[PDB]
Amino acid sequence: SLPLKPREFGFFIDGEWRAGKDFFDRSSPAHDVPVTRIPRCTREDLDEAVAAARRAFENGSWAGLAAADRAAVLLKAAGLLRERRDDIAYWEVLENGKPISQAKGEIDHCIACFEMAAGAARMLHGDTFNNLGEGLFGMVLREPIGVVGLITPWNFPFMILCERAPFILASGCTLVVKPAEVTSATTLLLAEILADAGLPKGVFNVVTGTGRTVGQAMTEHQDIDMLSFTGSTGVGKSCIHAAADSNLKKLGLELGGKNPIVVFADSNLEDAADAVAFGISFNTGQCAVSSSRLIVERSVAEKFERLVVAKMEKIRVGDPFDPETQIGAITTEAQNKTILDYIAKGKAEGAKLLCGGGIVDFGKGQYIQPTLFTDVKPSMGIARDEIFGPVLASFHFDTVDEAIAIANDTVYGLAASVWSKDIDKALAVTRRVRAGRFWVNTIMSGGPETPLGGFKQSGWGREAGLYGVEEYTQIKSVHIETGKRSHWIS
Amino acid sequence: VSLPLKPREFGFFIDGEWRAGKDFFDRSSPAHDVPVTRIPRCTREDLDEAVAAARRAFENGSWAGLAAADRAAVLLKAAGLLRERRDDIAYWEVLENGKPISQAKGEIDHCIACFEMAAGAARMLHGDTFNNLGEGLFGMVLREPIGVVGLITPWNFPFMILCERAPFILASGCTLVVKPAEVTSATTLLLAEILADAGLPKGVFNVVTGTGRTVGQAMTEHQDIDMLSFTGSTGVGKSCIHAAADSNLKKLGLELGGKNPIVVFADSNLEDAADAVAFGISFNTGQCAVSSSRLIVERSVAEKFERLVVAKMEKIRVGDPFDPETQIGAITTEAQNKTILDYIAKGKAEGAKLLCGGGIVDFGKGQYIQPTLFTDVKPSMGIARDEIFGPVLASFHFDTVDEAIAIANDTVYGLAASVWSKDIDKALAVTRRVRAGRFWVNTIMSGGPETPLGGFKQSGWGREAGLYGVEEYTQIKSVHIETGKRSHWIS
Amino acid sequence: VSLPLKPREFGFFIDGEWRAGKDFFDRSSPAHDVPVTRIPRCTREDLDEAVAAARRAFENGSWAGLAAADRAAVLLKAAGLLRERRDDIAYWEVLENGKPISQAKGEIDHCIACFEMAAGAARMLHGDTFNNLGEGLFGMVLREPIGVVGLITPWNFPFMILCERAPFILASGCTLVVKPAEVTSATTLLLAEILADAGLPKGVFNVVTGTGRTVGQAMTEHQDIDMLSFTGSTGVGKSCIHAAADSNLKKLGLELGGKNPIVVFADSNLEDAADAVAFGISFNTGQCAVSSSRLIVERSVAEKFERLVVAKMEKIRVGDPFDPETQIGAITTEAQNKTILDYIAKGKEGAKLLCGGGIVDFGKGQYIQPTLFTDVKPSMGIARDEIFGPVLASFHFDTVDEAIAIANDTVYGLAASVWSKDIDKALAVTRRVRAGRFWVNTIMSGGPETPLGGFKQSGWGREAGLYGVEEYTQIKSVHIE
Amino acid sequence: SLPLKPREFGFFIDGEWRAGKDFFDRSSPAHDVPVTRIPRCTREDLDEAVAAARRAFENGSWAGLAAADRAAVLLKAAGLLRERRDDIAYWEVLENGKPISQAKGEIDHCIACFEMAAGAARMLHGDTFNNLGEGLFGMVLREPIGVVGLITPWNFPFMILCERAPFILASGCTLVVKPAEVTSATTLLLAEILADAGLPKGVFNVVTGTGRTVGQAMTEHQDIDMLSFTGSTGVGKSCIHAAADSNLKKLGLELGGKNPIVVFADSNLEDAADAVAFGISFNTGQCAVSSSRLIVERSVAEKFERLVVAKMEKIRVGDPFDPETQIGAITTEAQNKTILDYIAKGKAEGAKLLCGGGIVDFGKGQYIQPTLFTDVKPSMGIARDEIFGPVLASFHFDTVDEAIAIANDTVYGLAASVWSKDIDKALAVTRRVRAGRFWVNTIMSGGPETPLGGFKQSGWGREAGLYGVEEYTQIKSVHIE
Ligand SMILES: NC(=O)c1ccc[n+]([C@@H]2O[C@H](COP(=O)([O-])OP(=O)(O)OC[C@H]3O[C@@H](n4cnc5c(N)ncnc54)[C@H](OP(=O)(O)O)[C@@H]3O)[C@@H](O)[C@H]2O)c1
Ligand SMILES: NC(=O)c1ccc[n+]([C@@H]2O[C@H](COP(=O)([O-])OP(=O)(O)OC[C@H]3O[C@@H](n4cnc5c(N)ncnc54)[C@H](OP(=O)(O)O)[C@@H]3O)[C@@H](O)[C@H]2O)c1
């Protein structure tokens, strides 16, 4: 089942797998066994990857193709994703700790993303303005912005990769990808999948390594035209600084969240409780769209919190390779400590622990119980800070206005969920809560047809959908004068 | 004809209310060296108040909660008031900026078009429905005004750039805190008056006048401005980006510098191209971010064309901006005047050949600079790379389409580009392969607000005008609704 | 308000010129039975002349060749003149139609919105670029005005429907030949004046007044009308369709009949729904294609709700359309008045009369009481056929599926209304009822931002919104190299 | 390699192959050997297929799926198309006569069409109007129109099918397909491909038979919500009548054409000559987008015509299974006579034959030479009538205005091609010639990213592109208060 020896990966620039010299040793967060050895690349490796990406972009080998040919590769990548689902998921689990059932289901979304991007490759379009007059023809062109840096986090290593890479590639952009050091394997597998899919060399390059070395060099890179960053708001701001200090590269930022899940008394309380438990426990709460702030109508608040407790206590925690396991390991020790500290702060600051609050001790790996706090004052740390763990903070409200104000009482704005059978309540919360991803009587549903992204400090730009493909294009307005010019100078 | 007897002292505009300043910036006509205006130097507390007003006006639904029809009504009425007040706006525009009155008036037409475009866009602003997701899953994408928008504008097209931003920002339901250039604040304050007369609710458009280093920097750093429209130098654009990172991650619509190529092919109408080239670098005395500052001309006609451009530049009517025949006006600021003259000196010092201009035009008053053409420009010279923001054209020769494109693309910028060729393939190749956000084919600086404008690379972020410019100040909200019965995660 | 001492004689409008009639239709106020207007009865030669003017105005670039900015300027100025002339348009609208003056005035607001929307759409009208086809292949999709557009409008919303078509057609650069309903031509000629005063070039908007038999049929058959907007009966729509096949294959934007459901759930705000149901069937005295003709109400509240509708339907102010308090005006034509009364007679097939059932006799004009039938069986005439009067047929249901099946049980599909606070019920009904215009917990509330049109036999194409501007454009794909 | 006995097909209803009772016997138009036996279905068969498509549409088995699931099937079908390329092309060649190389290359476009439709299935979207005020939310939904009839011609049996069916299927529409009786094989093969790709039963039904039996019943059917018709303008008009006389079904019409190819002196004349020869000789001119009217600048007209003559005479005519063969057989005897007649009419009316003008005698099928007439006067039959054969009518011009006026001098408006290195000429012609599919310095080059269709009598609606998927959706405006 688990690797007898950690799998040594290379990094990938210009279609060539490159042996590492220095390596990050990744142990399974769920099993405390060595699983992979990932090259710790240098800035020079990054430069070569950017150079390869630049070459692959400037020589027309990808952007010069018909959308049909880019779609062909992406549709083939999607097919290979299906064929390799189990292998990708196995390595995804090994490095991330998420359940194998979840990882497999994520691959389905990844396949949908590739198909969507393939479709979007063809539908990527600008405008014609044939309405400007007899001698004035206007158009708006879209063209791939060029070399796109892609930095991804460890919580959904492959999925977030597939929620970016295909959409970026679809327009004809080329990619330099730095996955999270702890979860680089499946990104390298995608590099192989893409190569097997017929992606030209240099179009998808993976420079593995640390955020401080490779990532920072990417965000500062003078020849990366745009960077998709998914990760903390803190490092996102560093990306922004780096863009300003380098080449003004565009940034597609997918940052933190402290997402509200607003539950009204007139919701299906059982459904909402399941969704709330799911919303904060999915990926063991290592989820930027996790519903970490329960905002429940006071009349059902205390019952509903308990409904969530019942739901959370039935969540199957265990070996992620158990197909029955529903939430897996905390991916990193730092995040594990962060979550535990936040639970400690929650207790210390006077919040009432309703369930969870501690580790799950399997003697191996790092697991944390789904945790629900109530009696949370908006000023508590667990109320404001992204815990990135299965830690739910519950807030009560009497009115729709209070619900949306609590929901909006955040620096973030990634996601929000509203549970109500009342169309007006649903639409009011949906329309007035500043979140880029909204779920009404659902959570974390919807495929790559729709753009995703955040308001406020949750990021810049949108990903997936046609939007996500357009996000990595530049808009070029073109005005053609066809009549004789009336001269400015006599 | 007649300058103000005493400089007109303006207020600033917060929450529908004109405010007396405490400290004032004294602005003299750059064309006349006469005091013309007196502008409040606002404080950060003023800025905070304006943001608070913009926030209030945004959150209380007085603007964003209206129907688009009501926002369109105000924008359309404002468009009407722009037409009615054209001469007055243009008068103050000329006074603070130095551009010719005829250009200033014609700029107002574009302003009217922008307000109409935005008024129309207000209604057409839309997201998506995904009715194709299955019986039990309904998806939509909403657009909504991002909220409080900071708007920082430069002095070169004070009113026009303002009107190329504010109505599109407003159209979605955003509220605005505006800092115009310190030296050209009047007409932005006039727009506040116009907008109020057009029925714009209080707090929706606020003007906090003052310096970019005080009010502007505080705007870019403001914890409660959700987005900042910045038009100005790439250098200050970078300050905005840092400031966004250091504050609230506000979105930035950046309209930055340019070093825009005008690619002239031998098979173009060379006389038309020469006129457009002369215009492209001389319009607004070259204080124009979309100015065609880099002539990229096919070597076979390069010398003929450069001479054609010189002949065109020599006839550009320089003079008193209130002369309706004046075609280029004063340099707006002394710093920019010195910068332009320095770049002309640097051009000569670096070995470029001056073909015409190269110096001031001395009227004994104000600051005028001759339309200036350099040839023998090497790509590494300062005038080849730095934006001079004056009427200084650098000429480069090419033999091949690829060379023209490589020269045209040889810049950190990517705001604008012009290609002159009757050959559809050359025109399309240059158009598609030169990294500029605004392309003109056999034209220059044409096309109204129907289309988005913006830059590639260091020329900015985002697009302005068109429906795009309205969408740029909206947030995209995906909404998935599950109907039917939830399949429970937990058993 | 004074009615005209002598009927106002109009001209028809060709190539920017007012044209004296030879023969005239004499129109009396349907509300006052006094002559109000005299309208030219034009010929095929007048029609051909207008089409030739519209052709000329289209081919010479005087309108389509302009920048969208200049078309927008005219439409915006037209919108301004509409506001200035609201009272005058509304007066003639009331005189020839019988709708209340208050309603006529509010319709003018929507007309202004339409002109503004059309002005905005003129600039935003766009196709696509396909810059993604490879370095050696560039693709575009151009939109261009289809050319000369015939516009046939009905008498129920003569000015409003005109403004819900004409500016959207004009926005793209199309030229128009308009035949309004013979009985309600005045305000269409007034728009011709408004458009001329707004700077519309000559020949871009031509009004050939007259009968559908002469002018309309000639429009639908015309070898040089590139597209025809028809708003009117499904029957005449089919005649337009036949005429298109038999002539030049002109495109048809058809806005046809309807038998629209208003689905009311017990969990709706029942008082609001009752008001909306009363409004939806009584607005314009039910002479409304988007009228909620079939109340589909949850059995658990059905007769209680029917009572609320009865109570509100009996409180609707019927009277002189010039009374600003009047909420329903006259039936516009005798034929329609007979039809509605006949349908009330047929209904009385055993349907239970709950309110109305008869005319309102103020002594003059033609008024019909807001009428509610219950115990309506799906096979009855009043259940299925469009009455085009203030005649509501009530049906009961227990399940969402039933409501949707009842709602969909029509050859039509113009409009639908669902009343429920339940989001699942609202979306299920909204998504599964085949109607082009849907209202959730509202009725007749959307402005011209959105396209309007029908499913099934309620029409072809959409009007209003940018879609409606696009409907009168041709799509031209362009591939280069 | 030729079939020993004609392949007897069934027709395809509700996922089941159905043995025919009456049969159309199809012989290879290129080889005059029996090739297929195709059910001549009845109107009852068609009713059954419609019922299945109605069933498959209403039970949510296709329209109720996520777009992802329809895309999955479409993408899988695209995969099966690639696997079955040779088999599809083989039967396509047998029944149509086109060269195997072209038939195989057409399948590439078919795959692109399925891929594009799969993509569009996911992107198919309407609008949200979140800008209508705090108390009014507006939406525009798109939804599959329902049961779509699909009637296709014999000139591109598989390609046109794949240029319609997947785009129609993409939205969730179900299909009843009648291919050309003479070329039904590969359409039945698509039904199988779609079944193997997991398409639910009843979503794609093929009722083979005649247009006058099966086709007319489709166009007249009371339960077909929209019909995609590709074929003659005459029959397109019959569909229009049938729609008016039945259920007001929407019509996507892809009708005739008389397409201009405007060649300027400043074009690459050899490139244009090759494109001109191809544009009229592709599919042996049995192509609605064929450039049948050469409109060439007088200054190079005769020089260019000679280049075209030289190009046409090198066009490899022969056995379509020869991979080197460039143009194949005339597909039907009626069309062969028609082409030959028009060549006769061309000579009889005084046009100067420069090349071709007769059959190519292989002792076997029906082949016609690429044919070029010059001195063609606008009143001649070959100038105006669609020949649907490899017969080029050449016209000369001096001015851009002339080229455009000649190009527009047709009742049709399907396609046009302009050849010029001059961007102004290219854009002027492109913008002013009323054709729905335009080629600049190319011919027949766009993939399915773009909509295709005609102006004027060349059809209604657009196909391919997201637009073509949208054409088979209904627009439903929704306003929520
Ligand atoms: N869709 C979303 O919005 C989304 C989804 C997932 C995660 N997140 C957010 O990410 C956070 C948790 O993930 P995390 O702890 O992995 O975040 P993180 O510390 O920001 O790491 C994200 C990625 O950025 C890299 N990185 C680190 N420093 C960098 C620098 N200076 N320049 C460039 N790249 C740099 C990291 O490399 P290393 O491998 O060396 O750390 C990693 O690959 C939460 O705030 C969560 O909400 C966002
Ligand atoms: N559409 C365009 O892309 C466009 C158009 C015009 C100008 N530009 C660019 O602008 C440059 C020349 O114009 P300029 O001299 O006015 O540019 P600038 O120095 O960047 O000034 C632009 C505006 O930014 C303000 N500002 C200055 N420092 C700031 C700071 N730290 N934070 C926030 N705002 C600050 C200025 O205030 P002060 O009034 O105190 O200077 C002024 O209102 C050229 O590079 C040109 O290409 C761009």
Author numbering:
A (entry chain B): 9 to 498
B (entry chain A): 8 to 498
C (entry chain C): 8 to 355, 357 to 489
D (entry chain D): 9 to 489
Can you provide the manuscript's text about this entry?
Like other members of ALDH‐SF, SNDH has three typical domains: bridging domain (Red), catalytic domain (Yellow), and cofactor binding domain (Green). The crystal structural analysis found that the SNDH could exist in two different catalytic loop conformations, i.e., the oxidizing SNDH (O‐SNDH) with a closed substrate pocket and the reducing SNDH (R‐SNDH) with an open substrate pocket.
To prove the hypothesis that the catalytic loop is dynamically regulated by a disulfide bond, the catalytic residue Cys296 was mutated into Ala. As expected, compared with O‐SNDH, the catalytic loop of the mutant C296A shows a significant difference. Since Cys295 in the catalytic loop cannot form the disulfide bond without Cys296, the catalytic loop enters the enzyme, which makes the substrate pocket present an open conformation. The cofactor pocket is connected with the substrate pocket forming a cofactor‐substrate‐channel, in which the nicotinamide ring of NADP+ is located. In the mutant C296A, since Ala296 has no sulfhydryl groups, an enough space can be left for NADP+ to enter the substrate‐cofactor‐channel.
